[PDB]
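> tool_call: predict_assembly(chains=ten)
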Amino acid sequence: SILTYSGGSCLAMAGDGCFVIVSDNRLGEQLKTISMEVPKLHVINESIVLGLTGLRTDQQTFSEKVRFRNELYKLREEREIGGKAFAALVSSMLYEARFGPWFVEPVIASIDKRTGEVYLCAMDLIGAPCEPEDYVCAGTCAESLHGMCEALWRPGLGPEELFEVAAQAMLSACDRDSLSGYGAVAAIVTRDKMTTRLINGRKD
Amino acid sequence: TTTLGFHFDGGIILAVDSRASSGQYISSQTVMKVLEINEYLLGTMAGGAADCQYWERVLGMECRLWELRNNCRISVAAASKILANITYSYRNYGLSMGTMVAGWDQFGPSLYYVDDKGTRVKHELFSVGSGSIYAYGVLDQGYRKNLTVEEACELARRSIFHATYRDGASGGIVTVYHVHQGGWTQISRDDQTKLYDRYV
Amino acid sequence: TTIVGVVYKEGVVLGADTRATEGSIVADKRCKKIHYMAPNIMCCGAGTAADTEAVTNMVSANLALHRLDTGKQSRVHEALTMLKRHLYRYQGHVSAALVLGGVDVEGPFLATVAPHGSTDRLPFVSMGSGSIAAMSALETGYKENMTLEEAKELVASAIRKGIFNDPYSGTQVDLCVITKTKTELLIGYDKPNERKYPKQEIRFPPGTTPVLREEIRRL
Amino acid sequence: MASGGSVIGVKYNGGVLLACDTLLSYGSLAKWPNIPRMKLVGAYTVMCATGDYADFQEMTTMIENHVNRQQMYGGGALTPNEVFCYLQRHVYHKRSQFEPCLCRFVVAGCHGGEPFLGGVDDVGTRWTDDCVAAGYGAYVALPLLRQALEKPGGLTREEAIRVIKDCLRVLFYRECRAINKFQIADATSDMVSIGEPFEVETNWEYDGFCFEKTAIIR
Amino acid sequence: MSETTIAFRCNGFVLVAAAGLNAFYYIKIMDTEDKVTQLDSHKVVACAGENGPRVNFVEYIKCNMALKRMREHGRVIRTSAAASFMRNALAGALRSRDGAYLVNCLLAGYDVAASSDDDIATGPHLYYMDYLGTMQEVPYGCHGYGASFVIAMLDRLWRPDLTAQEAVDLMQKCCDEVKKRVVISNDKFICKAVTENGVEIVNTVS
Amino acid sequence: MSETTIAFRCNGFVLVAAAGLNAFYYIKIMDTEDKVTQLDSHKVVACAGENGPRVNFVEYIKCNMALKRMREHGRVIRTSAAASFMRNALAGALRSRDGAYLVNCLLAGYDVAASSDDDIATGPHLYYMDYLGTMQEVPYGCHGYGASFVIAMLDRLWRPDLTAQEAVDLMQKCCDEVKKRVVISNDKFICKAVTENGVEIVNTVS
Amino acid sequence: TTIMAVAFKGGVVLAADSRTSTGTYVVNRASNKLTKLAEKIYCCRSGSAADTQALAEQTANYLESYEIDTSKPVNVTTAANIFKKLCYMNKWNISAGIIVAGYDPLNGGSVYSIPSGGSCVKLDYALGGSGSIFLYSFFDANYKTGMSKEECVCFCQRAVAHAYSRDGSSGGLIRTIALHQGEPEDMTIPWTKTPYCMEKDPKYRDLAVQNPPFSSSAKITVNQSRSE
Amino acid sequence: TTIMAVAFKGGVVLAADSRTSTGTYVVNRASNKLTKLAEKIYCCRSGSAADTQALAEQTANYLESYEIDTSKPVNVTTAANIFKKLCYMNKWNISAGIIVAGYDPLNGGSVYSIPSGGSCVKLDYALGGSGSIFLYSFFDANYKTGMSKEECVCFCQRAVAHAYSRDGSSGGLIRTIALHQGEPEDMTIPWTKTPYCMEKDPKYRDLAVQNPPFSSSAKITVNQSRSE
Amino acid sequence: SYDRAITVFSPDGHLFQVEYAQEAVRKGLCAVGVRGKDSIIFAVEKKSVQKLQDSRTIRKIYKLDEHIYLAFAGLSADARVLVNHAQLECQRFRLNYEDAVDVDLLVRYVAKVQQKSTQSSGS
Amino acid sequence: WSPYADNGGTIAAIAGKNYVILGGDTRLNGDFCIHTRDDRTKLFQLTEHTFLASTGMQADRLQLQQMLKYRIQWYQYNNGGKLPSTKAIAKLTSTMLYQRRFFPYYTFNMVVGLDEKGAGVCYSYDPVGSTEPFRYGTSGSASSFVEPLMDCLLTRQHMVELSMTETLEMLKNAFTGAAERDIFTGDAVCFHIITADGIRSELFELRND
């Protein structure tokens, strides 16, 4: 499969006026490992983080299109885009390419700066949104991420407990996956601050 | 999978990893990929796990009957032959195997490679499996005949380690065995992540 | 998916289950499958979610211009027709399947639209993977000039057949009720699968995960 | 390739009902509308199947003969549970030779005041339960019988008949290769009996089915 | 993967090397094709793959860079921009009618301050690319069947502070390992170095 | 055809040579496998192809010849009978269940009078064979991808009256041409000579 | 599907079953396969419902335009030709078998068959759909020219019912419409008043003797009804 | 092929067309598809002629042996079971649809259908071959129980003729045979005395108006017969 | 096919077929073996010197492999069969195990061929 | 027509110093349907200390269970009435699966039991019989999420002894989460706790949808 060629996984969870998003650091060509220092997270503005997985040429190209449109948005509109409009926009671009797709699967995580309400979205490769309240994930160890989060996640959590949940998840899931791994990077976002952490993991 | 072996002045080293990977999902990190056939011969296992374990167990049953019938230990030449002839006869039946056989009989250390088609080759240095293409890189720089036992165990450990670091389907614990005149000896097991910190 | 619709004496009831799946895993337990088309027309969707979303949105936008232009209320037939033209053009590549229901000056209207572009106006319909199970509740239980309450009980029972017998459908019933004068969404009308064993809480004391490196940024 | 459609069955307090229609098809052709598809096997047991009628005939012959011979040569009367077990072994064996029995069986019976009902599919899968079905029965009927059995303390004979008929009516409405003509067998008091064919009442007269409302072009 | 290429970056240079071989099926046509193409005064690219995609591709890069330098008074473009340009063209071709360039590249540059106003971090950069448009900065990288052997040696022996002489020895050993273990014959390597003073051929590496 | 073999017959000998290489896909496992197998005191066979068919095949020839020599008081079999035996087995396997031996062979013998009663023409004979069971006496012959290059050189340079020294030079040049022009690496050759006094390795030919 | 049209003196009758199916499962049991093209021209649709709905809609759009221009009622042959051309231009992309029939003052009642491939044939009756292959012999044996409107409605209802009793892919209601110089007359017959089914036909009442009891005689009598 | 058998009180009638074809071309126009299995048991063969000739020959060989052993005439059910088993054991290797019918003193006239796949069904009438799908409705509409021998021969002849007039793969003679307590009666009707064909049926005499002349009116009248 | 039981016990634990086989050995010409330090010597008696017998006489000491000889006494034709089986066995072993068969191994193969002929119906 | 069907569902086991706990769900799935919510064929007892647990195709697990049940009866008859230990049955089972190399059982199996020292063990197999002895194991539809969770809670490799009760609660939690997310796993779980004393069993409800 083509969505698994390059490797990688991403996960985002919500808490109470916070989220965490994590990605692994591996880039590959099927089983051959090219780099161990490629995190898949992109910061859009103070409020929005983008995760992309799938084929790396299309992650690289589709994030450059997102960046381009965002810059023009900011000059026309003289403001930052909100999490929900950014996701609707992303969706529109994936579906523009409905009969010849970008092989990416995005994970968007955001927070309304005013109301402190957290918006999560994940998309299939033609832009169908899946917007639950607990978590989202994508990439080569998404099956194994589901059950980690169903058993560790709980409503209400604050930044530091949400960070442990979300790091134990990513590590235990990457460790049963041959195409994602080499530890992780996590962004933790509140209305007030954005913390980043590089987490240690296995060297296989 | 990664396995290597080579022959030097003090005997033979075998080293392996312990991961079993469908291709995406990792089923185990604790496979024992060296097979103690008996107490003077070792196999290694690469390719299909069920195939290698059934046929080396069969091999071990023939090495034992030989020794009941003849009152003496079978040679490494003949052991590898029994196994090459089984693989040869199954050539058309889809087995998947890449084995080393190693022993120290009366003519000294012998290392063979034997595969699912019936190949059987004797030589002084081999590496088998998906990560072989990285192990040979490190192993060809460091290998020579007059290594000490400690230097040779380090060379093999560092070689498997470098394969686990770069190959998706190799990983886990690195195990090194030494085949000497007296039989064989498991020398070490070290998790490859703990080795990362030793070598950085 | 299990979507259902019925006509009753003064309007339409649409129903849906709420599980969305990727593969054989539940991605979202409480997804919303009943979509706005106009003040007096809603749509439930099955098929490929992206396609069902794109076409409904598009026709809902085009119906809105048409109401600003005409200054009249949207007709259910107009929606049905814009839907079918679009799906016909794409030869089922756009694989949306829809139950459409509304009420306009000519009374209640309920129809299905398949992905190749065929339509069928009928007094009761089902679609999606649990369509068969659902449809067996509807044929035993529909009658003419049902009251609102009977209609709601029939739609919910039809969705629950899907929920418990089709593996791709699950969680709860959402209804939508449409009448000459209002549209009323009813998320979680029926929740037949609540928790039993309250979850074991598993805790990680902060500082459980080893961090190599940290950076902070004040907003 | 005479083939039978749906079969359904349900347990009630005191016994079990099996039902099907009397039709063999060939593809879309309704070829024989007057075939009795249910077969009595021994003293306590009755079977039916969806699928290839030739494979059903062959398999029930083989079974009925084992059962009758065993009884006649001093080895007693096989029970539903035993018949069922033997069936599943033979289905499985044939699958294992790549010469399958292309049928799906439903088996019913009553021995020791305990009613049996179970299913066997063409690769050898078997299960017992309070309601079993084959064909479009599994998609159309089971949701109704299962809803019916939710009531606590189980079903009376009459409530089991009513719900069997509602399922029949839906099959007749939504299953292409069917007809409005059905039989019911009833296992109870350690014996099976097969009823005469009957028909169910259907509805066709809703206002939403009229010509003007279903017209594609006004 | 019949043509191995190799590159690594050290504190004050990049070494690049590529196998000379040009083949027609099993026949060796020649073993001295230079595949390490200079793009500008402080850039090279080693491409792997067929003559035709490979030449057409690097000629298109060269001409577009040359056109960017006169429409800009001869100002040297940064290595990271040349890589971004290369990447967009590999990616574009991949969704085009005529289809992808089947070339795999290693781009090596040394960035040097345009003017005094220029705040640029001055030094060597290496970029791995693939025919799909994957692109990644790296401290070393390779393509072709010899790639795995060399990558592991370099994981084992490469450090950032190698002197120019040690890094030639290491480049030499990586070429020998390719010869020893790859069945396709990569018998002769051409190796160039990219430094603050520009591109220069390394003669002792064969 | 990854393994080239070569042979030619001159007035009082046959030279045979075969490439040492054993490979697993693109990886060189070793380059010193002797593939020129001695069958008896005045016979050799160079086989080309996979280890497994190749070993099983020549072991079966050896054992059946050995069994023919004790059921006959150690009398040496003629080269043309060994070839006829080899041919019948290649041909037989080709119509068998398990299918053909995928080996290509060159059989070289020097025939020497059994007794005084024996009228046999005494000298060297070479036979080409293929995995199908084709068999043909020849003054020189080859198998593998290097075969065409060498066949033409020998059409150009081979004569019957070469001295042992000239024929080693010619064998050496044929091995160099294979190295120069075949992309698969046949880097090391083992070469043996079959004479009136028996089989002997030729060390200067590498 | 089973569709048909029949000419009588002064008009036509069109008839159809009411079933839409996915092969094995009925998705609509009350379709309307008699589609209006102009006041007195209808078609009977068979094949893909998506295709024949789109071509009928398109044919109707063209004829309404033409009638406004001309200011006259449109003749059947015009309907038939417009449709035919649509069916011919798209022959590789659709599955459609059509019958156009109608009344017009110039040529009276007329019937055109337009089968797959897009030919167009002008007949006294036409059959179509999967269920048609059961009615050729029916019509050969039982149909007559000279029938009145009432004979022809009744005959069509009885043909459809014969077809749909044996065709797995037809069933449900029987709809008809009669077109002539007067007002269009439509009729729908529910399955419970069908003039023929095998379920009610007395020669299929008694069951085949497939399941005789274990007996001491080769004589065959009755199906075993109760356990021994 | 069109084959059929019908029970009457006291006996059966078997009927068949006479054509053997390669698809498009008739290789034999006078086959005999009514094959004898014992004095009063016959079968009607459809499908591969090679297969059904070999299975009938084999079934006949077995029954003659059995009748010598038993010393009794053989019952129809025995013929039917022997054949059925041959048709079931070889189902993947043949193309055969068979009807066995016969008279015997114990059970009178009986008819078994043995279609492809090797089932065996005991009926009051059976249809088979490609031409069968045109006769279901015929029989549903026109067949009755209680018919005498003479009514049943005549009815069979008329059914076969209806079938073969519409089935490209049937045609030629109509052969029948009547089996009862008396002597076997065979009959062959030539195509020139067939009780039905479309060539002689008056509702198909006048030709469809596909080729009207170039005219100044949309009115349709007659086919153009002569150049202008 | 002939399957009679030939070698059977009789009333005191005697297998007569085996005894009479050993009688046949006692009538056969004498053979001797003698093991030195590093040489084995096989010596056999030949029938009787004749003018007519061929000077190049047939050998009654057979080679089984490059390093193993056999001499016998008894029915010379039976022995030729036995020597055949043993030559096959040595070559079979090279083919299955690459190494050359040990004498002690080859002896157990032969001895078991003799034992089986004392228990195999038909023979 | 394939000879293969996957009837779905999940099993899981955990060992500790003198007990093993074994769980399997009770749904039997068809094609887009459910045959029943109360199948108990996934777990099969072989001796009083040894269980077989299987997922995949149910008809295959029923055959394998019978072939094992008669090899085990034969061992007893040939061995003086004794039962083979858990280690022996596990080796027996591997041997037997390999032997259908060429037309394999579509089964993911576990042999679970006490060892000779009284401690739990679990052998997970592939379809042709490669295995090892481990402290925990899982297989089937939900196994790719149950397994990292058990890796996490029992080994704790990315962090800084349990009772029978704590272990039974962990498994109960793991099946509850599996049923929420895996659409082929549900209804109930049958749990057997194996100690030297004997075998305790306990049903446990799960989501019905």
